[PDB]
Write a protein that binds this DNA or RNA. Sequence first.
RNA 1: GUAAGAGCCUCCUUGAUGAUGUCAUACUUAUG
Lengths: 329, 50
Amino acid sequence: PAHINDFMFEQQRRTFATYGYAKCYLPKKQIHVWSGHTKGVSAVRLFPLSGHLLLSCSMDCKIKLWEVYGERRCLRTFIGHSKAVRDICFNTAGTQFLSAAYDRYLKLWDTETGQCISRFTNRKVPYCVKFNPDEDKQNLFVAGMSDKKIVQWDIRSGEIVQEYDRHLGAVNTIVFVDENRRFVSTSDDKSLRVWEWDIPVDFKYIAEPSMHSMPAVTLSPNGKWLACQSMDNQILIFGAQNRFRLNKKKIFKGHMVAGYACQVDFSPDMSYVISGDGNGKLNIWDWKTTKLYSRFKAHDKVCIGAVWHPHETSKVITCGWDGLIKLWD
Amino acid sequence: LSEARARLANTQGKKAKRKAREKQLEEARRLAALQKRRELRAAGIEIQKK
RNA sequence: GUAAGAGCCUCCUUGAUGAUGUCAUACUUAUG
């Protein structure tokens, strides 16, 4: 160590800047869907009364109006959606429609007029949108959102209808029955719960550790049974509820579930049920025989879902996938 | 007697029973959450992180 | 009757059915 007094002079020179160093039906593909979209199909809709007009919803956030059945070409284009449509809906007559947009914006759409209806919003991103059965007025629509409460919404009155929480899980989809006193509610909690709806109180809840999510939910046209395909690729047919049991049809396996919700299809001859597969193959099932039909691969991409013709006799079944849709005879 | 022998095979207990219900319920909740998450990630590119 | 936890402030597979309601009995409730 050096001297501290010398370090003081060295610091003083440093401040001075001194540098000195000194017998089953076999349907086949009929025709491709009208037009199409690059983005995956968001929802598959169709005209309930006519059946010829199909409304294709895609992830492109543009509602695609399609004319389909016969002389095959689409309908027109529909815009105005803020973000990708989470769900699609339509009125009983078909001239009016409802839209559920992942922007958390529910926008009704007029179709036959060439343009939509109006733009609306909700509290959270709606996970389900469905029209109200029974009374032909239906000022409210049965819907559901990430808030985990099935809520009907009155529209033409300027404000919604009511909100009711059946379960703590986010409602995946809601399909109201014909009795109008109960509406089947499937939620992300995996618990299938019917809900008394018009009354603020629900109905009942069942099967929380079963029926994984809600990949497919459907009911027979006769209303005797409602089957729901589950994300284990396990189709659980539930005998519909009026009873002490009030559930449980049968068990139908053989499908494929990749986790994406697939639109369930059937042939309502009292015969068949057909739905898409998670791998993209076309799932054909014989139903009333308690066993399926056959698995015929159709779409090259992940199958979004499928639809069926009206109920008269065997006719044809439409199909759709991600990025493209194909109808089968 | 049949329920007594089945209970003898059930000797795992309510702890292992709640562990089995938590494993099946956790696998179903992970299959549904990862399910819908995979359905959303395949369409839109906007997602948060875990 | 209650310690703890959770998140939102470019190519495949082995074919067994269903809807009309009531008693002894078993299990789950802080309403006696």
